[PDB]
Amino acid sequence: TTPLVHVASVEKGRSYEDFQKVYNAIALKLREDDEYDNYIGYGPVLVRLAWHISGTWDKHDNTGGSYGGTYRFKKEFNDPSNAGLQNGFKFLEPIHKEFPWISSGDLFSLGGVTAVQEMQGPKIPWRCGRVDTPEDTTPDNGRLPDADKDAGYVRTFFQRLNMNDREVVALMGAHALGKTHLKNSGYEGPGGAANNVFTNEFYLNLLNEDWKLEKNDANNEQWDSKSGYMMLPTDYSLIQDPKYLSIVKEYANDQDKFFKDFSKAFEKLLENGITFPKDAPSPFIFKTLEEQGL
Amino acid sequence: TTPLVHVASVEKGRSYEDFQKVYNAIALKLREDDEYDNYIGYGPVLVRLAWHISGTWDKHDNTGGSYGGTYRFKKEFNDPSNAGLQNGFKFLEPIHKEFPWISSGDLFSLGGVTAVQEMQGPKIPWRCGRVDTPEDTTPDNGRLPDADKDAGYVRTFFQRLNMNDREVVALMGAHALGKTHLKNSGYEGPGGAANNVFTNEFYLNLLNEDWKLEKNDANNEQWDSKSGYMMLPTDYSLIQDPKYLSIVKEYANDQDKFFKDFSKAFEKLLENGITFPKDAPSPFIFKTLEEQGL
Amino acid sequence: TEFKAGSAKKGATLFKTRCLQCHTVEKGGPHKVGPNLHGIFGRHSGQAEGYSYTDANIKKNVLWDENNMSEYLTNPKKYIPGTKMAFGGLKKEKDRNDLITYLKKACE
Amino acid sequence: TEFKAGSAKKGATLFKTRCLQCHTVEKGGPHKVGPNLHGIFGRHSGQAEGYSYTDANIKKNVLWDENNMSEYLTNPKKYIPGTKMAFGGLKKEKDRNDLITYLKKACE
Ligand code: HEC
Ligand code: HEC
Ligand code: HEC
Ligand code: HEC
Ligand SMILES: Nc1cccc(C(F)(F)F)c1
Ligand SMILES: Nc1cccc(C(F)(F)F)c1
């Protein structure tokens, strides 16, 4: 019966103004709850959540993806690779009750877009229309990438998401955000000093820091710098691969180009698997709180 | 020689969006500093402030009024009638730093408008264009009304502000907000249960509560109820006077009508003494924080 | 639970400043502007005998728990349109946790 | 003053978690991502010895006191457009008050 089809259906009677208010609510809670994770804030974990709900997508049969909003169900919830994302879900649940008309998928992806922008990242155009689907459509565990791999694994994995070399290197710049937590992933440490502000630091630290391969307290191995930063084995593989390396150099030298490419790739990621109608509205570019004087 | 005319002059290059951001900054600080005065908040003192800087007006020679922003000068600032308003000025001080272009008069009146709207009161149309005037234009003390008086005094006093019976009874409904503080005025206590939400409770409590005239701890005489509420002698005189009584009963039965009349009289109060040019902008209706998704 | 936990001593000061003027908590406490709140958790809305509610509060028919309490106290008129509870709302999460923590033990 | 003396202990926890990763405070402490902050108060912006500033931090030329420091920390790139200090900002007044109080003592 071929890959199934997911048709974006705009929440009945809603437009830009409605979603901007959801944006604002998320954005205001981001500013208010500044203590979380030793004052890193909820920004990075909301970006990770958007990626994890989207990263389940399989282009071959159109299963997974952000459309169905299936992370709200137990099976995807207790996915061991989603360890720690419960915090992001609990962050968004009171806002869901505030705007119960919004689909789970639209909410999860919007949280990602809001976090990136509010952390002074690039503008990310966002489209509505994701629709909640039954529990039996929930993707099985094991669809997300393993961090203890090399460049070839990363390149092949992301083909399943229809991403090419430039898209993957751009997306991975988001690993300047937040940190790995030993209790969640078996990895520990931040990747730089600027943990909750969106910059091209990932690429700069990748090239300019002195990295050493070490065992952490979970006996997993990671690249550590004397300044106290870490890189996952998959992240470091970006400078082991010649094609990835040239793109890494590119973003290190030009944050503007990085911002533009990340915006495109992140939107594509959040929209993978979704069929947008001809009469579908143009994507929204939300204003930040700063722009609104809020 | 020749009558004093105060012509509204718009802050250079400023428009609605500029003042909406001043509104928002006031409204956010309202919600942030919510512990003030045992969690009453800054709402009530901000509307008292707008009233006190406006209530200096004399219709006969157009002295006083909100135009000149002369409350920033020592003589008016240390008026015994303004005791306790320092807190409201301190509140707006960081706001004025953020928006140095706005006149003192526009800031004080906008404070009152913002507080009323954010306390779920009626929308109050507001106009900009007040201009700071020199220290020598500062009104002498004694122009504000005394609380230990009767209905005749109230009526006569408000004649000087060009206010009729319906206007004064409406304006007086603001005494639902906040409380009297012994250290400030020599009176103590709230007028009712809902202290920082704008309602018609002042009128209902005036005729549904059983009041007794007592001496407080400053030896001033005030009307007390068994519920623990108080009224000033001037407040109670509104149900002693037959003409005032009929209007009090009207508002006690129709909050929508009270809201409409208050909105008119309060804007008139804040604009007394100001000449608006024919090409001056139409009055602004600011969106509340809630209307912006917050 | 979705409701974490807060300070009961801080919750107590919130209740006395922002709730007590309309609500009593102890057993047999009198109805005031608002209904007595003893046994509010584990009770459907608008069911305290002796108090006259709005139709809105009664028809809402929600079973009060720590979570829908938090939603209600954030913006009373939004959660129950037509309610006559005139309240600014607890716009801070910590304040909500603190008060609900106190309210749970106080209305035992 | 407009600025108020807050908690130095709370300011210390604020500094440890949001500043220390880029700044040291004690006398003669090393420059890291950002300049060492010893003797920052009463000193013009861009005067730390050995650090490489942006020409936006220098041309601002502001005499750091507890007042304009509060403005800077609220929003760095708004007060100084072009600074390479990537920091969200202390948006809460009490947090700013607490941090400055700590920073006053620590940078003496
Ligand atoms: C008066 C000024 C009040 C203040 C302040 C608070 N409440 Fe209230 N409450 C008030 C009224 C008039 C009503 C009935 C509303 C209606 O539509 O009938 C209520 C109701 C409640 C309820 C629901 C009770 C029930 O369903 O049986 C709760 C749980 C409640 N109020 C709690 C509450 C808290 C915790 C407050 C302060 C933080 C608070 N109220 C303020 C009147 C007033
Ligand atoms: C890196 C991720 C930083 C964080 C977090 C904080 N600061 Fe910062 N700061 C940083 C840089 C790279 C610079 C130099 C800016 C330039 O354009 O050259 C600064 C600057 C300051 C200054 C001004 C110093 C001077 O003018 O001599 C101050 C007073 C300062 N920083 C303080 C400060 C505080 C209190 C912070 C946390 C609350 C903080 N910074 C965060 C890098 C980074
Ligand atoms: C576009 C966004 C994005 C992409 C793509 C992405 N991540 Fe990350 N991931 C994040 C963010 C942001 C964090 C930090 C979250 C936090 O601090 O809580 C994170 C954290 C992690 C962590 C640690 C989580 C913890 O709490 O310990 C692991 C492990 C991880 N990612 C693996 C991967 C791997 C492997 C890939 C690809 C091969 C990948 N991620 C791709 C955004 C992304
Ligand atoms: C439209 C607004 C308005 C008008 C008109 C008004 N007031 Fe009030 N006044 C207030 C508000 C609001 C407060 C509460 C301030 C607070 O809670 O800090 C207040 C406070 C007071 C206080 C006590 C101040 C203190 O801190 O103890 C006195 C006394 C007072 N007003 C006298 C009067 C008298 C007398 C009149 C008229 C005869 C009058 N006011 C008219 C709004 C008004
Ligand atoms: N997953 C993650 C999160 C933050 C930083 C990093 C590092 F910089 F180490 F790559 C990885
Ligand atoms: N004087 C005065 C002022 C404001 C409020 C009240 C009260 F609410 F107490 F009636 C009285």
- Looking at chain B, the residues that come just before a C–N gap of over 2.5 A are none
Q: Among residues A256, A195, A227, A64, which one has the least CA distance to residue A142?
A: A64
Chains in contact with D, where contact means 3 or more Cβ–Cβ distances below 8 Å, are A, B
Give yes or no: residues A252 and A185 share one domain.
Answer: yes
**What CATH number is given to the structural domain containing B231?**
1.10.420.10
**Beta pairing class for A189-190 and B274-275:** unpaired
- Interface check for A66 against chain D (CB to CB < 8 A): the answer is no
Give yes or no: residues A85 and A150 share one domain.
Answer: no
CA distance B289 to A25: 11
**Structure tokens, B161:** 């502000």
Does D107 belong to an annotated binding site?
Answer: no
Residues of B at the A interface, defined by Cβ within 8 angstroms: 20-21, 24-25, 28, 289, 292-294
* Ligand 1 pocket member C74 (CB < 6 A): no
Does C107 belong to an annotated binding site?
Answer: no
Contacts of B32 in chain A (CB under 8 A): none
CA distance A86 to A248: 32
Q: Among residues A250, A261, A256, which one has the least CA distance to residue A199?
A: A256
Give yes or no: residues B288 and B248 share one domain.
Answer: no
Contacts of B288 in chain A (CB under 8 A): none
Give the type of residue at A223.
Answer: W
Q: Which of B190, B199, B290 sits opposite C86 (nearest CB)?
A: B199
CA distance C14 to A200: 45
Per the rule left: phi > 0, alpha: psi between -120 and 50, beta: everything else, B219 is left
Q: Which residues span the domain enclosing B272?
A: 4-144+266-294
* Ligand 4 pocket member B178 (CB < 6 A): yes
Task: Return the half-sphere exposure (C-beta side, CA atoms, 13 A cut-off) of residue C53.
Answer: 18
Element (H, E) at C22: none
* Resolution, Å (one decimal): 2.1
* Ligand 1 pocket member C46 (CB < 6 A): yes
* Ligand 5 pocket member A178 (CB < 6 A): yes
* Ligand 2 pocket member A40 (CB < 6 A): no
CA distance C2 to C5: 10
CB A32 within 8 Å of CB A95 = no
Element (H, E) at D94: helix D93-106
Question: Around Cβ D66, how many Cβ atoms within 10 Å?
Answer: 18
Chains in contact with A, where contact means 3 or more Cβ–Cβ distances below 8 Å, are B, C, D
Residues 6+ apart with CB under 8 A from A213: A221, A222, A223, A224
Question: Around Cβ A293, how many Cβ atoms within 10 Å?
Answer: 17
Give yes or no: residues A51 and A87 share one domain.
Answer: yes
CB D24 within 8 Å of CB D32 = yes
Determined by: X-ray
Q: Give nearest CA residue, ligand 2 atom 34.
A: D19
Q: Where are the domains of chain C?
A: 1-108
- Token pair 């009945």 is at which residue? A12
SS3 D1: coil
Give the type of residue at B144.
Answer: L
**CB spacing of D91 vs A195 below 8 angstroms:** no
CB B113 within 8 Å of CB B50 = yes
Interface test with B, best of C18, C85, C87 (most B CBs within 10 A): C18
**CB spacing of D86 vs A31 below 8 angstroms:** no
User: Ligand 5: distance of its center to the CA of A174 in Å?
Assistant: 8
Give yes or no: residues B83 and B218 share one domain.
Answer: no
* Number of separate domains in chain B: 2
**What CATH number is given to the structural domain containing B66?**
1.10.520.10
- What are the helix (H) ranges across A33-102? 36-39, 43-54, 74-77, 86-98
**Structure tokens, A60:** 């071959």
Give yes or no: residues A171 and A67 share one domain.
Answer: no
Contacts of B93 in chain D (CB under 8 A): 2
Q: Give nearest CA residue, ligand 1 atom 28.
A: C37
**CB spacing of C93 vs A33 below 8 angstroms:** yes
**Beta pairing class for B6-7 and B274-275:** parallel
Give the type of residue at A220.
Answer: N
- Interface check for B34 against chain C (CB to CB < 8 A): the answer is yes
CB C58 within 8 Å of CB C46 = yes
CA distance D74 to A69: 36
Chains in contact with C, where contact means 3 or more Cβ–Cβ distances below 8 Å, are A, B
- Token pair 């990363």 is at which residue? A154
* Ligand 5 pocket member A43 (CB < 6 A): no
Question: Around Cβ D42, how many Cβ atoms within 10 Å?
Answer: 9
**CB spacing of A193 vs D88 below 8 angstroms:** no
Question: Around Cβ A271, how many Cβ atoms within 10 Å?
Answer: 23
Give yes or no: residues B109 and B140 share one domain.
Answer: yes
CA distance C89 to A176: 37
**CB spacing of A97 vs C71 below 8 angstroms:** yes
Question: Around Cβ B144, how many Cβ atoms within 10 Å?
Answer: 17
Give yes or no: residues A172 and A270 share one domain.
Answer: no
Nearest residue on chain D to A28, alpha-carbon basis: D91
Report phi then psi at A208, rounded to 5.
Answer: -100, -15
Question: Around Cβ B174, how many Cβ atoms within 10 Å?
Answer: 21
Which ligand ends up closest to the CA of C40?
1
Sequence-separated contacts (24+) of B16-20 with Cβ below 8 Å? B16/B281, B16/B284, B18/B99, B19/B102, B19/B106, B19/B110, B19/B126, B19/B128, B19/B284, B19/B286, B20/A293, B20/B284, B20/B286, B20/B287
Q: Among residues A138, A173, A172, which one has the least CA distance to residue A155?
A: A172
**CA-based torsion, D53, D56, D59, D63: positive or negative:** negative
User: Ligand 5: distance of its center to the CA of A241 in Å?
Assistant: 18
CB B237 within 8 Å of CB B217 = no
CA distance B276 to B282: 10
SS3 A223: strand
- What are the helix (H) ranges across chain B? 16-32, 36-39, 43-54, 74-77, 86-98, 104-118, 151-159, 165-172, 182-185, 201-208, 233-240, 242-253, 255-271
Give yes or no: residues A55 and A196 share one domain.
Answer: no
Mutate to test the pocket of ligand 5, among A230, A234, A240 (most ligand atoms within 8 A of CB): A230
CB C65 within 8 Å of CB C71 = no
* Ligand 1 pocket member B194 (CB < 6 A): yes
- Token pair 């790739």 is at which residue? A265
What kind of fold does domain C1-108 have according to CATH? Cytochrome Bc1 Complex; Chain D, domain 2 (1.10.760)
Q: Which of A33, A93, A98 sits opposite C2 (nearest CB)?
A: A93
CB D97 within 8 Å of CB D3 = yes
CA distance B140 to C37: 52
**Beta pairing class for B221-225 and A221-225:** unpaired
- Token pair 């390396």 is at which residue? A245
